[PDB]
């Protein structure tokens, strides 16, 4: 019926790998606090006091996997749905 | 059932349950602290109070702490030395997933009987994973043991003393207030090598279960 | 630091055994001669890239480079 | 401390990246313009299928807009010499891009206005040739974009 | 000689020499198996664009080069542009670093990008897992790299030429052609491996022999072959590779 | 110390790899399209079909946009003569293949289109050999690659 399969699944298959590569992405940089070589950016410019900061901003930064993540983890839901309207 | 409780394979597995459930989450969230004085020849720059924090999984290499270099007010990052995540990660996260393992077991047992009974195939997996598992187990516990070791050597404050460059000069009086404590340590592999054996025994119960 | 024997070792040691004892434990068929020499050619072809791999890293001659940050950053992640 | 002539190279800049993406879009409209003079003809009810064109030379002329804007904005009387260069070499690398971009999307346009008019189902596939045309539109803009501040 | 048996497993070897990345093999790996699993309801359909047809004709081709490409991205260690880090990296601790009388020039740093000369005595250690991480964030990381790889498809060049040359005497044998065989494969043969060998087995030795403490005299191979093709024989300004060597 | 006019060279070698690379691939583009209006009346079905060399043209604009990046971010204010030469070399160099690939590219694209207008089976042939003018594109930017270390 309403959003056919054709027009979908491409969407589909999109979803799952967004999820699954930002819940990589989120882990990665959250348990292993995104060891510097496979993360160059960070957040601030004053960092001459200690490694609290550097930790405390990668978990902060990690946490930002949620929604991106959980975006999908909706949008694949919905485009299943569409895709079961027959 | 209360016959397949009064069997003698519930009760050591629900037991043996237990024994690896305490032993690894007692092993997996530890921390500690040992405590150091630096003297010089110059009493004003002298640190009498130094502390130094560990922890699980005893990466030992992550470990370090300022001191005073006892000229001109300098100060200098020592790094205790020592790469031993390896073994300890390796048996906790492998533990970790004997546990699930382990929950998965009970349930077969409490729930799935009916399953365990139909043709006894269910044994026959069983044993092949409680075989593996009690393989992994030997080969955590020796790398375990060689690995606190290497942690009890690199717990000697001689060592660290003898690490950090001004010491060699004279007045560099750095001593030792308060040793780390190695009861944590040594009773947790004690715990790892009774459920270890235990296991063994449980490996023995189910082959002899099967037939 | 990592010791060179070692790798070397298991790993001549594991494809040659693999690349010796495929074909005689691969059942006899129509089809026989052509999976044994996808197997052979794989294994010479997969080991000599391996070795030049590891050969290339053996003895360097100039150090990485490295900017400031990462360094002050790598002195406290690890090691 | 500086020589005056420093202001040379930047303002060319702040010209050129108007004035050669202007004479781009003389073209992308121009020449469209008169193919759709002949698809007039046969059938004069799609030029609402034929508009594209000129709505990319209007695209890539607001791009060149937009960067001779942004460059002209960070005009200053002691303008470092390395900050003349840098405008400079964003003015006329957009505008001369621009310049290429509106020469290709005016014949594509001459010539699948007319395909379309003998053939209707060209019509769709024609658009896909377009926004390859446009795309280049953008690279330009990105690079002064990317001279602007670093 | 049919071809088929040495193409059939060279071709995505070759593939994944020039397809170096891990997460594109992933990727490549399950179009392929989304093509594969469907092959009865494909077959039993109705299908009308031409690009669908020619890459169902190629799935297997597809299927074992995207396996290929798992492979050499992993010994590549750039998977998604970043490095798999192993974490064995053994390059640079702080009180070695001191040690060699290097202590907070962090802050001249700041501005510069200071290279560190290699070998202070206690550092060094291949990789087993491939190419060592480090490299995925050294900004010198292009000079070693395009060694590495000019060397590589060299060498792979060389041996798979010989590889194809070495096949036509089988057939000659085969034919009973004798005046095709004694005066005809063996001088091609001798020619090209007098050639090419002579530079593999340089390459190799220079791999091998010359430590990094003898950086500077260390030679440079393309010079000595273009000597040799030249026959100038220059007494000073490069080194003799080993002894005997005229 | 280094002149003030150092600085000029490098940043001219940017806005070289972001015209003359571009200018090639806009001729392919356009000359393909004229291609696809020939073919588009009497095999209609093969529209489609010939969004090969259209793409292939627009790669060497990607190119382009790869090396323009780097030389966006070496370019600092104490550059030494050296780096400057180097960089203008790099950004010739890569701007110059380009453009004979697109040139390349626009004619093989027409010949391509055409042939297959009225011989399904050369179009396997066609491909072959647009293959070859891609590849020297990549060969300009190899040198570039070499020219940020030497």
């Known amino acids: 019926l309403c959003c056919g399969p054709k027009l979908a699944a491409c969407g589909i298959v999109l979803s799952a790998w967004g999820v699954i590569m930002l819940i990589m992405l989120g882990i990665f940089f959250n348990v292993h606090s995104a060891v510097l070589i496979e993360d160059v950016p960070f957040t601030e410019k004053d960092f001459e006091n200690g490694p609290q900061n550097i930790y405390n901003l990668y978990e902060q930064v990690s946490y930002n996997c949620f929604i991106a993540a959980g975006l999908y983890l909706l949008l694949g839901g919905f485009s299943f749905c569409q895709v079961r309207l027959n | 059932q209360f016959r397949v409780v009064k069997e003698p394979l519930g009760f050591v597995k629900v037991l043996q349950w237990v024994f690896a459930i305490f032993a690894f989450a007692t092993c997996g969230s530890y921390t500690g602290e040992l405590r150091l004085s630096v003297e010089c020849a110059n009493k004003t720059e002298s640190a009498l109070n130094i502390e130094v924090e560990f922890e699980y999984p005893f990466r030992l290499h992550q470990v370090y702490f300022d001191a005073p270099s006892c000229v001109k007010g300098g100060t200098t990052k020592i790094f205790l030395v020592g790469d031993y995540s390896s073994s300890a990660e390796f048996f906790v996260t492998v533990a970790v997933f004997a546990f699930l393992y382990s929950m998965g077991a009970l349930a077969t047992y409490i729930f799935l009987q009916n399953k365990y009974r139909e043709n006894n195939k269910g044994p026959m997996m069983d044993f092949l994973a409680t075989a593996v598992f009690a393989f992994m187990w030997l080969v955590s516990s020796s790398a375990w043991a060689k690995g606190l070791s290497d942690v009890k050597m690199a717990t000697d404050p001689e060592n660290i003393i003898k690490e950090m460059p001004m010491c060699r000069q004279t007045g560099n009086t750095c001593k030792e207030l308060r040793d780390p404590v190695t009861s944590g340590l040594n009773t947790s592999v004690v715990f790892g090598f009774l459920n270890l054996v235990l296991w063994v025994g449980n490996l023995w119960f189910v082959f002899k279960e099967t037939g | 630091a990592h010791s060179f024997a070692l790798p070397v070792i298991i790993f001549t040691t594991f494809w040659g055994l693999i690349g010796i004892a495929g074909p005689w434990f691969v059942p006899k068929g129509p089809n026989r001669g052509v999976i044994i020499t996808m197997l052979v050619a794989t294994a010479v072809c997969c080991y000599l890239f391996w070795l030049i791999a590891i050969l290339a890293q053996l003895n360097p001659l100039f150090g990485p480079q490295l900017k400031n940050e990462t360094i002050w950053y790598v002195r406290f992640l690890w090691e | ?150 | 000689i049919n071809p088929a048996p040495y193409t059939v497993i060279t071709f995505p070897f070759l593939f994944a020499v020039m397809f170096g990345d891990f997460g594109h093999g992933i990727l490549m790996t399950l179009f392929a198996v989304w093509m594969v699993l469907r092959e009865s309801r494909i077959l039993s359909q109705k299908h009308e664009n031409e690009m669908f047809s020619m890459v169902f004709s190629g799935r297997y081709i597809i299927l074992l080069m995207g396996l290929f490409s798992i492979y050499t991205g992993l010994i590549y260690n750039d998977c998604f542009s970043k490095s798999l880090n192993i974490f064995g990296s053994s390059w640079s601790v702080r009180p070695m670093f001191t040690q060699g009388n290097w202590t907070e020039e962090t802050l001249l740093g700041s501005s510069v990008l200071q290279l560190n000369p290699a070998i202070p005595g206690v550092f060094g250690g291949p990789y087993p897992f491939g190419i060592d991480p480090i490299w995925n964030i050294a900004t010198n990381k292009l000079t070693f790299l395009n060694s590495f790889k000019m060397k590589m498809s060299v060498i792979l060049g060389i041996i798979h030429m010989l590889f194809g040359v070495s096949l036509s005497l089988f057939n000659h044998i085969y034919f009973k052609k004798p005046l095709n065989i004694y005066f005809g494969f063996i001088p091609e043969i001798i020619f090209m491996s007098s050639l090419f060998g002579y530079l593999v087995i340089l390459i190799f030795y220079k791999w091998t022999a010359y430590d990094a403490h003898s950086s500077r005299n260390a030679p440079s191979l393309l010079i000595h072959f273009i000597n040799m093709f030249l026959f100038s024989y220059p007494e000073s300004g490069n080194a003799m590779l080993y002894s005997g060597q005229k």
Request: hydrophobic content about 55%.
């Open chain 4, 1 to 150: 401390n500086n020589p005056e002539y420093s202001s040379f190279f930047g303002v060319m800049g702040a010209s050129s990246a108007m004035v050669f993406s202007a004479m781009g879009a003389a073209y992308g409209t121009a020449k469209s313009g008169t193919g759709i003079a002949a698809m007039s003809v046969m059938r004069p009810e799609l030029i609402m299928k034929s508009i594209i064109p000129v709505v990319m030379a209007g695209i890539i002329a607001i791009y060149g807009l937009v960067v001779a804007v942004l460059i002209a904005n960070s005009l200053t009387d002691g303008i470092t010499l390395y900050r003349s260069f840098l405008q400079l070499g964003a003015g006329l690398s957009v505008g001369l891009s621009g310049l290429a971009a509106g020469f290709a999307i005016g014949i594509v346009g001459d010539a699948g206005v007319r395909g379309t008019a003998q053939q209707p189902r060209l019509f769709v596939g024609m658009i896909l040739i377009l926004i390859f045309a446009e795309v280049l539109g953008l690279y330009g803009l990105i690079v002064a974009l990317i001279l602007s501040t670093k």
